[PDB]
Design an enzyme around this catalytic site. Structure first.
Site, PDB file in Angstrom:
ATOM      1  N   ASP B 169       1.016  -1.059   0.010  1.00  0.00           N
ATOM      2  CA  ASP B 169       0.030   0.095   0.211  1.00  0.00           C
ATOM      3  C   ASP B 169       0.929   1.298   0.093  1.00  0.00           C
ATOM      4  OD1 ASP B 169      -2.530   1.255  -0.318  1.00  0.00           O
ATOM      5  OD2 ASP B 169      -3.284   0.473   1.799  1.00  0.00           O
ATOM      6  N   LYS B 171       2.396   4.742  -0.639  1.00  0.00           N
ATOM      7  CA  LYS B 171       2.304   6.049  -1.567  1.00  0.00           C
ATOM      8  C   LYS B 171       2.294   7.237  -0.612  1.00  0.00           C
ATOM      9  CE  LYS B 171      -2.649   5.096  -1.525  1.00  0.00           C
ATOM     10  NZ  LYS B 171      -3.737   4.639  -2.422  1.00  0.00           N
ATOM     11  N   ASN B 174      -0.332   7.634   2.083  1.00  0.00           N
ATOM     12  CA  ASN B 174      -0.365   6.526   3.261  1.00  0.00           C
ATOM     13  C   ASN B 174       0.753   6.800   4.118  1.00  0.00           C
ATOM     14  OD1 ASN B 174      -2.741   5.484   2.165  1.00  0.00           O
ATOM     15  ND2 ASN B 174      -1.790   3.675   1.650  1.00  0.00           N
ATOM     16  N   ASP B 187      -2.007   2.274   7.433  1.00  0.00           N
ATOM     17  CA  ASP B 187      -2.968   1.633   6.648  1.00  0.00           C
ATOM     18  C   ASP B 187      -2.313  -0.093   6.357  1.00  0.00           C
ATOM     19  OD1 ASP B 187      -4.121   3.804   6.521  1.00  0.00           O
ATOM     20  OD2 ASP B 187      -4.992   3.454   4.462  1.00  0.00           O
ATOM     21  N   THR B 204      -2.210   0.606  -6.011  1.00  0.00           N
ATOM     22  CA  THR B 204      -2.796   1.940  -6.512  1.00  0.00           C
ATOM     23  C   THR B 204      -1.874   1.787  -7.654  1.00  0.00           C
ATOM     24  OG1 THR B 204      -3.040   2.880  -4.247  1.00  0.00           O
ATOM     25  CG2 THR B 204      -2.448   4.303  -6.314  1.00  0.00           C
TER      26      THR B 204
HETATM   27  C1  LIG Z   1      -5.439  11.929  10.079  1.00  0.00           C
HETATM   28  C2  LIG Z   1      -4.623  10.749  10.819  1.00  0.00           C
HETATM   29  C3  LIG Z   1      -3.859  11.333  11.900  1.00  0.00           C
HETATM   30  N1  LIG Z   1      -3.145  10.628  12.742  1.00  0.00           N
HETATM   31  C4  LIG Z   1      -3.372   9.156  12.719  1.00  0.00           C
HETATM   32  C5  LIG Z   1      -4.016   8.554  11.643  1.00  0.00           C
HETATM   33  C6  LIG Z   1      -3.984   7.181  11.511  1.00  0.00           C
HETATM   34  C7  LIG Z   1      -4.539   6.346  10.492  1.00  0.00           C
HETATM   35  C8  LIG Z   1      -5.008   7.133   9.433  1.00  0.00           C
HETATM   36  C9  LIG Z   1      -4.825   8.623   9.432  1.00  0.00           C
HETATM   37  S1  LIG Z   1      -5.434   9.258   8.105  1.00  0.00           S
HETATM   38  O1  LIG Z   1      -4.504  10.401   7.568  1.00  0.00           O
HETATM   39  O2  LIG Z   1      -7.009   9.803   8.100  1.00  0.00           O
HETATM   40  N2  LIG Z   1      -5.654   8.420   6.642  1.00  0.00           N
HETATM   41  C10 LIG Z   1      -6.857   7.506   6.597  1.00  0.00           C
HETATM   42  C11 LIG Z   1      -6.664   6.085   6.375  1.00  0.00           C
HETATM   43  C12 LIG Z   1      -6.716   5.648   4.834  1.00  0.00           C
HETATM   44  N3  LIG Z   1      -5.243   6.220   4.428  1.00  0.00           N
HETATM   45  C13 LIG Z   1      -4.812   7.512   4.474  1.00  0.00           C
HETATM   46  C14 LIG Z   1      -4.498   8.003   5.867  1.00  0.00           C
HETATM   47  C15 LIG Z   1      -3.473   7.100   6.271  1.00  0.00           C
HETATM   48  C16 LIG Z   1      -4.655   9.319  10.627  1.00  0.00           C
END
Ligand SMILES: Cc1cncc2cccc(S(=O)(=O)N3CCCNC[C@@H]3C)c12
Lengths: 20, 353
Positions: B169, B171, B174, B187, B204
């Site tokens: 995954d 990118k 992420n 992720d 992706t």
């Molecule tokens: C905002 C954020 C901020 N802090 C921790 C986080 C942990 C997981 C996912 C996020 S997140 O960025 O909302 N997020 C959603 C999941 C799908 N992939 C994109 C990214 C990793 C967090």
């Protein structure tokens, strides 16, 4: 330029995985 | 040869110490995998603050734990929607992995729980934003800045692959940046335990290895291909293979041709040709010398691998941070209720969550 080609692709935003 | 006696001895010792670290880390991972955690909090233990991210998966909200005042990122999944989208196994797998791993660049799951309608994974709040946003805003990262991030991914994949986990995954979307400017990987839905090969078409488009596109059995080497894509995109500002539509991207990926900006160093281009190597028999990270072909490459000659692991390197970029709960490095999203039904949904499907 290659940058202009990238802009033209329309894939400059967040990209989804295949399963979407 | 290339190394004199002192450098060769130091490198050998370092590589043996990595092996010793990974053997202990695998022991710890397997012990936690055998005996996880579960139902460690509930919704009314937290104040909901703001939505930080959305997707077909559900939403991520900034929350504040009432008792401790700590902020967290709470991922909320609608069980019925997870079922409809055929993501049951991926969701259970993500939680099981997050519960069992431990590494400085892998986000930490602090609580998990479920109710009649939803699943909840409460992770450390990573306040610096998505690498994606910073990359698009700045345009491109200098080679030292890209290298600092790349080294963290190399170490993270060295860790995950030692546990037989393929990530699949990678990118900029992420990768989050923490308060000290280091990366957090988050992720794990598409990650899989694969000692040998696996076959699922997932990932992706821009980041897919050729052997995935070509519907072959594939292995951990797809993550090293993806690292090549990431390094290229960090340093150029755009990925190596793009087009209007995925099918045209795939034709470029499988072609064995890649072109580089004129500002790329020769060391960078050499590394990238060896990561973006269509022939699995020749791809760095997939040869007899394993991760060492990458860590010992000239482009990483200035990287102090232990100092990166110890988080003792000064980051090239520190995101803005006004205090706990600062959400300014993330976008704005429409705020929606989180309704929980009076009737349990999908109990059987998610019994192990
Ligand atoms: C905002 C954020 C901020 N802090 C921790 C986080 C942990 C997981 C996912 C996020 S997140 O960025 O909302 N997020 C959603 C999941 C799908 N992939 C994109 C990214 C990793 C967090």
């Amino acid at each position: 330029t290659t940058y202009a080609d990238f802009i033209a692709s329309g894939r400059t935003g967040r990209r989804n995985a295949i399963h979407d | 040869g290339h190394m004199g006696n002192a450098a060769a001895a130091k490198k050998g010792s370092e590589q043996e110490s990595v092996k010793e670290f990974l053997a202990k880390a695998k022991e710890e991972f397997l012990k936690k995998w055998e005996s996880p955690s579960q139902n460690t909090a509930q919704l009314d233990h937290f104040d909901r603050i703001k939505t930080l991210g959305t997707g077909s998966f559900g939403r991520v909200m900034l929350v504040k734990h009432k008792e401790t005042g700590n902020h967290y990122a709470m991922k909320i999944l609608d069980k019925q929607k997870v079922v409809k989208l055929k993501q049951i196994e991926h969701t259970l797998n993500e939680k099981r992995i997050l519960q069992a791993v431990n590494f400085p660049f892998l986000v930490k799951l602090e609580f998990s729980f479920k109710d009649n309608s939803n699943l909840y994974m409460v992770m450390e709040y990573v306040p610096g934003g998505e690498m994606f946003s910073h990359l698009r805003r700045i345009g491109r990262f200098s080679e030292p800045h890209a290298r600092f991030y790349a080294a963290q991914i190399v170490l993270t994949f060295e860790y995950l692959h030692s546990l037989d986990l393929i990530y699949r995954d990678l990118k900029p979307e992420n990768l989050l940046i923490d308060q000290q400017g280091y990366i957090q990987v988050t992720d794990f839905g598409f990650a899989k335990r694969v000692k040998g090969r696996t076959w699922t078409l997932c990932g992706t488009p821009e980041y897919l290895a050729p052997e995935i596109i070509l519907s072959k059995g594939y292995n951990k080497a797809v993550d090293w291909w993806a690292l090549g894509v990431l390094i290229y995109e960090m340093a150029a500002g755009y990925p190596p293979f793009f087009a209007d539509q995925p099918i045209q991207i795939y034709e470029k990926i499988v072609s064995g041709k890649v072109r580089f900006p004129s500002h790329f160093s020769s060391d960078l281009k050499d590394l990238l040709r060896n990561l973006l190597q269509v022939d699995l028999t020749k791809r760095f990270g997939n040869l007899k010398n394993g991760v060492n072909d990458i860590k010992n490459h000239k482009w990483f000659a200035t990287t102090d691998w232990i100092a990166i692991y110890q988080r003792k390197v000064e980051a090239p970029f520190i995101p803005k941070f006004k205090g706990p709960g600062d959400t300014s490095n993330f976008d704005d999203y429409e705020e929606e209720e989180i309704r929980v039904s009076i009737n349990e949904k999908c109990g059987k499907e998610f019994t192990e969550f």
